[model samples]
Target: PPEETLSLWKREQARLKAHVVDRDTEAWQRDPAFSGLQRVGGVDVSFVAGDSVRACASLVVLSFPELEVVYEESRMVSLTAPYVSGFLAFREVPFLLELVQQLREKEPGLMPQVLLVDGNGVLHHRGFGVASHLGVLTDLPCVGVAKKLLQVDGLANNALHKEKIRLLQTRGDSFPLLGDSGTVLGMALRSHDRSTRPLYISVGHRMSLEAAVRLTSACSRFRIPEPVRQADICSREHIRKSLGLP
Candidate 1:
């Protein structure tokens, strides 16, 4: 039954969520400038021609501080699972896991110290978004940086939220995304001076909320951080190239 399947997926999330470590586990993660961090990565999956069934999954690793793209790989994947609002990771994680494992074997030295996922962490109905899911499975430090608010737990884009966005006057400025249950799910950060739309930063694994926000701000070269930005671009390019479409 589809209802049973939903329950099963929920159970899986709960099981995996238990493994997530929402604290700074590495020395570089604690440093204000992320001093010891050598590499950072981002993962993204882009659909093909607006078709959700087939997509390109990409992983980009960038040199830290400099934020230059060092390595990237994108592959076409078939997502059999249908879209479920809270369970996107189930469809996307399989592709990233393959990319991550290959990097582990083929280029261990270049493995990123942390990963920036273009999704959420504990800012979902289940409190376990794609970022947290990937982090736990890969045992890597991951941070969830979303372009849009998930709008769960009574978090809405109402008057108060809009006012808070206005209050973020400068880059690195932010406000808490306090949920209905009083849980601080994530943060809305003014990533760039030119862009008013804030990026939502959340802890994925082995990182604290503060460090996640700080590192995300440090990684941005524009509205979106370089890692995820590059990943998105590369994935889209790959799809176009593969399909021979402009």
Candidate 2:
């Protein structure tokens, strides 16, 4: 068993997160916190319409940057909430929570230090979005590496970073999406000289925003973070398998 000090670390993580008003864009690139690192995981949830209001929910869990399948669980449940802009936790978290319980019961040893997600964290109006909600519930380090911009202010159109070795173009945009106060809510990830759409990361429950981005960067390979990519594929596959449809 891990030490009780781990719980202290977890609480401190969330404590630091509470201070940051919005997404920690500055710290994302500056903080140097890489201690007691270990396996990372990705968790994702996808739904399939079964019949009428019935739907099949799939939860996919995978290893970190390696993108290895660790566990998957699927079950049918009635669709609860409508697909709204910021109310996804209500719609998807219930089923995912049940699936997590199932995983804990079946495979007790497969746990992760970091858990990347495909949703929002501090980059939401409520701040307790899916990423943070799940992190609080599981007490695991989590990050939301979203695919699109959540809050778009003039930040997306602002100047790019100046620290680039390229002689052709400016450095990649630091914070692509901004809020009303020009506060950065997300970042446009660049890899292999190519820029990715964007990833909305934050301190889940036991991690900081800067820690989240650095951990996310470590887990990413091509474009999207590896954990998220693996979770996406696993969630989609679980949905397909349950419904027996393409």
Candidate 3:
């Protein structure tokens, strides 16, 4: 079954890749009165203990700048595929999309201008991670903020080098995370003044990497951005309740 599922997902990923819009579409930028980003969203998923097929996915909307929760939704879904590294979107996005659609139907006014996803975006082996896939599916601006860097295609090589270590030791600290070809893939951000670890942020869809980094950094009240951090907490709480765990 895993083999069959993998084959199906490979074909699906190819289709998903074609739908990914990597350019800055400026869709999220708007007039002050009607800016879509007044409300921003975040998404994350949690797995059942010892069972990867069952998962709880969450989407939380927060008032941007203020970062207060305005709307939230979650759902349990049966995954068709396994948790393969490069194919993570296939395993989790079905329920995330379902939750987002449910929000649009029940809380239409609370729709978020942009979405922050708790996974890689263009930082994947295929350049089409969950954030990219979800952005394409939802046709909304999306940004990927991950706790750890995805080292693919030389994306983290320079950031992991000794010079970067030297820079981190300096007063300013932190540096742009560069790709093998010297392209700036994302920023390894020291989100909090006290944080020793950096968050890796990359463009998902309909936005530029610079804008993604700026917005993500702006949303930070902790090491992780507020929306995504809230999503993380909400997803875990939902799963814990579903399982009757203490």
Candidate 4:
């Protein structure tokens, strides 16, 4: 039954891949379709210290450019699906989708123009990671920002030479994340000068890699971007408080 379930899930991902919009030419920062971004959202899921099945998911909306929290929600959830490599979207995205529904219902006006997810967007083996899954399901523009570099053909080599490659010569400097087929999957971005680590950036849906990097750069107050960093902190704290852990 688990195999059957996974098979169906794989089929669904294939179907969903049709909806992902990967290319971006218009500048999202200045373009009217994505410009005037007000509220940006962040989503993260945290597991219990000992029990991996029990999870805490958080969705927070913050006023962009200002980075002020306007809406925040987090709750414990049951994860029936086990973690399968390259199938992470199945395990994590269902609860994130639920959180999106809750946010829409409670704070309708505060919905985000762009969402920063704490997972890979298109930087996966199948190019349909959790961020892309959430973006397609919600029809929201989202960007994926991960702390660790997913070791792929083009990226694996750059992981060794950090100072040599600089794709975006902007604030923190970055290198383009290219795949085996020479397709640009994302960017490895150093969002802050203080941080030696770079955050991996990818387009989830309805945006370009350039736009994704720009917004990601603007959102960074530290090593991790503000939206995602806050979401991670909020979710972890929620789990800690819920468990009454010291």
lDDT values, one for every candidate: 0.93, 0.58, 0.80, 0.83
Taking the tens digit of each residue's C-alpha lDDT, what string does model 4 give over 102-156?
Answer: 8788779998887899998889878888889999999998899988878754567
Comparing 2 with 3 on TM-score, the higher-scoring candidate is 3
Q: Candidate 2 at residue 6, lDDT?
A: 46
Best by lDDT: 1
Q: On a 0 to 100 scale, what is the lDDT of residue 99 in model 4? A: 87
Off by over 4 Å in 3: 1-8, 27-36, 156-174
Tell me the TM-score of model 3.
0.87
- RMSD (Cα, Å) for all candidates, in order, is 0.9, 9.2, 3.1, 2.6
TM-score attained by model 2 = 0.68
> Please, what are the lDDT tens digits per residue for candidate 2 over residues 1-246?
145544554454455446433333332324454444445666666555443445555555555445566666556677655555555666666776676677778776766665677787767655556777776666666677777656433333333422321222222323334466865555444432365344556555566565566677666675777677767776567667766876
* TM per candidate: 0.98, 0.68, 0.87, 0.91
Q: What C-alpha lDDT does candidate 4 achieve relative to the native structure?
A: 0.83
Q: Which structure among the candidates has the greatest TM-score? A: 1
- Clashes counted in candidate 1 amount to 0
> Candidate order by lDDT, highest to lowest?
1, 4, 3, 2
